[PDB]
């Protein structure tokens, strides 16, 4: 999984975590057609690398958290930047 942000920043995600992420209902079914090519090179528009990084980290965390890391508490609600991501709405 190769993510591409508006800043031209590429993010390579390990398939090990990607598989688990795919199990969760993501915005992959949002657009009209999400062909195999789109699943390889995912280009996002109006989405900065900075905010995308937090999303990727949260996904990575969630993958482990809902797997073998459910012993710890939920993500620390310290940085109030999650609502900023919710501003996208279609995510």
């Amino acid at each position: 999984v190769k993510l591409i942000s508006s800043d031209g920043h590429e993010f390579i995600v390990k398939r090990e975590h990607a598989l688990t992420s795919g199990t969760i209902k993501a915005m992959l079914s949002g657009p009209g057609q999400f062909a195999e090519n789109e699943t390889n090179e995912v280009n996002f528009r109006e989405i900065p690398s900075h905010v995308l990084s937090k999303v990727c980290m949260y996904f990575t965390y969630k993958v482990r958290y809902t797997n073998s890391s459910t012993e710890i508490p939920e993500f620390p609600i310290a940085p109030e930047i999650a609502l900023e991501l919710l501003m996208a709405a279609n995510f």
């Binding site: 905010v51 609600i77 109030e80 609502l83 919710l86 501003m87 709405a89 995510f91």
Partner: protein, 32 residues
């Protein structure tokens, strides 16, 4: 969709929403 629900399960922020400021990359704090 996904993040729409995951965001609430990440941080419960009851702050104001306003169009993102082009100066940086974050939503402004006002109302609309």
């Amino acid at each position: 969709g996904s993040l729409q629900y995951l965001a609430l399960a990440a941080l419960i922020k009851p702050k104001q929403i306003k169009p993102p400021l082009p100066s940086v990359r974050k939503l402004t704090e006002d109302r609309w």
